[PDB]
């Protein structure tokens, strides 16, 4: 058995955040019924298709392990169908605008009346009660709102967005925590709850380490592990020096260590013509003797200018520069294997091509080839949590309205009324 | 009632990933008993302290709602105490190196014998069975291994780490999903399971969209929404036009839209001296007329080379440069409100300074002032999921071994036994 076997999810979600949540629930066994707007469905279907009139990879990689029903929710018959489905649901998931579901005729209070056991889960841009609770928020705007853009990139460059979906997929995974937590209390109370995750808040949770830094900066005036702490190292575009003398908000640290020990992104053989020929190399305070052996600087072992974190603050970027010279004739895997001999945390920048075809990720079920006879097989990311008792079974994303009749039959409707709903264009 | 009230967590975790998980479980009501190495404890206590001999903000912001017991686990008495604690635990959480808990004397098989209901949850670098299963991984090494670094930053710069903890806290949040899922299934089976999340996999999950792009790129030879698909725009090391002709792995796209529609990071007034004076501005397809209005170019509304995503592909970066000129005399909040009265998708880069003191985030319980009478109050990030039925009650982080005797008394030990354990330096 799987964790969410027998959990019925009434899934209103579209785009990335909501759909990621419900897909992952589906991977863990949930019965996910995706309600799609009649005639068009989820906008991801037609976004950046790789083959004309075939559902895009955007759609398929976020909508496996779901069934699709088309529904016109503006009709009295549509609202009536939702009421019956709400009565069979364990969780309702949505990412409509604020109030949208109330305006559709389904307030939390009316939903509780229909089903006291149902959990209502929502993805929002900003938290309810926020000054911006009504603003529309998409991926990169959430990254900007939550502190990530401000603290990502370089001191002499702009705020920069992460390639990782810190806004969308991250909010969906956070909502899944919320939903699962609500299921856990329901075993105690026998009652459903409303749970909501704001995209700003999900981002902020991941930038907790930068709120640490903001407070440290306020309290002490310096962040010793940042490149800017090195005297005369960091400069802006115009050549003005950037030191903590005048920094009042956590700055961009380039490739600094963050919540890790100090580190940097170092070039390996081929970097000029291969964008991903780098390693991340860490200088852990308890590994200085090992590093010194590796780079043949035994004279740095007993020197206090080199052998403590504090001693290294004025020169750490120089040290990285020197270490980097040792990698000039080695590729990133050779360097990783070499550092690993020393027990030094160091690893390659994996290219997306490398990840897509990596046998290890397919062995452990993290990159999964989905069987799709209609569209052709494709890769997706599987469950990142591995369990002793089960494996997800990932099945292809649904065609638009593919399971409409199937779902209506399960609601106990006979063929006559199904015909009529189709005839009436409710479904 | 809180979701995890009554859930006893035996918490071996240290640094960031594991502690973020168990902290957040604590926020949702779990009884978290943090096992710390006698005499030193969690390394974060001493990491980048703002006051000498006071637990650092790294520690306090990841270890609220926990109690601390000191234990020498390599003593036979320590192992016995652990066996007693395992019998009262619902969840054990750890992020030691591969095999480390086995070597401590507690294989999964032994653990199941001790307590058939206990869930064992682990943070790992790479998944079990991976070719790199034995590599040491922290934050930015995981960002590199999971595809984020390769696809974050600029085409003419290096792979770039996110300021957000994509490796650590993200893996911790993923582990929380796995633990809650294991709790869900235990209600059915009456048995605990083993659950593990690899930091690589947590990262790859958030970069799902880049694996979408890798497949699109392999299937079609182009990613039309990327900066490199604008002819003669992106330039290389010597200064020649970039194109997808020679790109076989998803490249860095600077501040492009990602999972969102096309956008860019645009300077606002003061950008020269304020690193965060920017907005993110999206050119959504259907919003095009409103953008032509705001920017005062109704010519483009009907012009076929301007009013279509396909038409814009060859000069989208030229459009952004002009929209940016309209913001040069307005701050990021003035630019945002101006776009918001045309319904246009736009948001400011929020600084850590702004976010740390934002009234709205404190109102909604996302930024929380923790009352710490020992060390002085500090801010933290609260729960990013908001529930109708309860609010977290965040309480200060424990001093090292603060609750040792309290916890031993809960195990049924008497004062003579407790005194003996202290004398033997077991606790």
UniProtKB/Swiss-Prot annotation, chains A, B:
GO biological process: oxalate catabolic process
GO molecular function, one term: formyl-CoA transferase activity
Pfam families in alphabetical order: CoA_transf_3
Active site: 168
Enzyme Commission number, as recorded: 2.8.3.16
UniProt catalytic activity: formyl-CoA + oxalate = oxalyl-CoA + formate; formyl-CoA + succinate = succinyl-CoA + formate
GO cellular component labels: cytoplasm
Influence of pH: Optimum pH is between 6.5 and 7.5.
Compartments, as annotated in UniProt: Cytoplasm
Activity control, per UniProt: Inhibited by the sulfhydryl reagents N-ethylmaleimide and p-chloromercuribenzoate, and by chloride. Competitively inhibited by acetyl-CoA.
Disulfide bond sites: none
Pathway the protein acts in: Metabolic intermediate degradation; oxalate degradation; CO(2) and formate from oxalate: step 1/2
The protein's enzyme class: transferase
Gene3D superfamilies associated with the record: Crotonobetainyl-coa:carnitine coa-transferase, domain 1, formyl-coa transferase, domain 3
Mutagenesis or variant effect for residue 168 to S: Loss of CoA-transferase activity
Family, per entry: Belongs to the CoA-transferase III family. Frc subfamily.
NCBIfam families given in the database record: oxalate_frc, PRK05398.1
Task performed by this protein: Involved in the catabolism of oxalate and in the adapatation to low pH via the induction of the oxalate-dependent acid tolerance response (ATR). Essential enzyme for the bacterium survival, as it relies on oxalic acid as its sole source of energy. Catalyzes the transfer of the CoA moiety from formyl-CoA to oxalate. It can also use succinate as acceptor.
Protein name: Formyl-CoA:oxalate CoA-transferase
